């Protein structure tokens, strides 16, 4: 019967939900690490825009927000 496939998917999900719990703080470090590079790479993309347009400095009053930051 099809139960031979639901059980196989049950064990994999049950083992994955223990791999996250055992190494929860390892994922916390990596997630924040990827978020910093995500923000930094976004800054370089905006920095490329104004440099190629001929300007020397970013337009006055423009401070790039940290979109990938925890807020509410």
């Amino acid at each position: 019967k099809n139960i031979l496939k639901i059980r196989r998917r049950k064990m994999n999900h049950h083992k994955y939900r223990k791999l996250v719990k055992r190494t929860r703080f390892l994922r916390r470090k990596v997630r924040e690490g990827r978020l910093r590079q995500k923000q930094v790479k976004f800054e370089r993309d905006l920095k490329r825009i104004w440099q190629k347009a001929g300007l020397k400095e970013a337009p006055a009053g423009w401070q790039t927000p940290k979109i990938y930051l925890k807020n509410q």
């Binding site: 993309d45 347009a53 001929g54 300007l55």
Partner: protein, 175 residues
């Protein structure tokens, strides 16, 4: 928005003769005072079409149906303002607007003269459907703001270049 007067006979008990000779008691029992919201809508719909429509006896016309939907749309908005957490009526309000929006587009492509009069009288503002419906996330709206601001700054750099630098060359000519 419209406000039907309170002391008015309901739609049905109007054309029958010999009403004004009746005492105030029966007139009170037939006025909008002792009638629920349903009878109020009839008076709103009856008055509204007689002010904007050309031929009131025609119900199958697109303009007549648009007037009918507008009465329901206004009624739903009044209900929504009171019961804010109601979700069944909020869905009805959105679908009623979409149906009126669809019918206004159909009227525009067939009879422009009538469409202009309907749009002006009812206060409806017809906006063309914007192409490429996309979800404006924070990254896109931020980068779009920068590009527009950089574009304005480039204009100032060139505009002052057109003024000062040309004048400096013209200074040699003028002396």
């Amino acid at each position: 928005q419209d406000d039907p007067p309170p002391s008015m006979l309901l739609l049905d008990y109007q054309n029958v003769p010999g009403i004004h000779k009746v005492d105030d008691v029966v007139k009170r029992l037939l006025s909008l005072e002792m009638a629920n919201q349903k009878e109020k809508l009839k008076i709103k719909k009856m008055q509204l079409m007689n002010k904007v429509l050309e031929n009131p006896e025609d119900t199958s016309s697109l303009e007549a149906r648009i007037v009918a939907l507008t009465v329901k749309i206004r009624n739903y908005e009044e209900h929504m303002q009171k019961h804010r957490k109601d979700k069944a009526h909020k869905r009805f309000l959105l679908m009623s607007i979409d149906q009126r929006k669809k019918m206004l587009k159909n009227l525009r492509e067939t009879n422009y003269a009538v469409f202009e009069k309907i749009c002006k009288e009812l206060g409806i503002e017809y906006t063309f459907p914007p192409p490429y419906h996309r979800k404006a996330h924070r990254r896109w709206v931020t980068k779009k703001a920068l590009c527009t601001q950089v574009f304005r700054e480039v204009q100032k750099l060139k505009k002052q270049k057109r003024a000062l630098r040309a004048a400096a060359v013209a200074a040699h000519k003028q002396g």
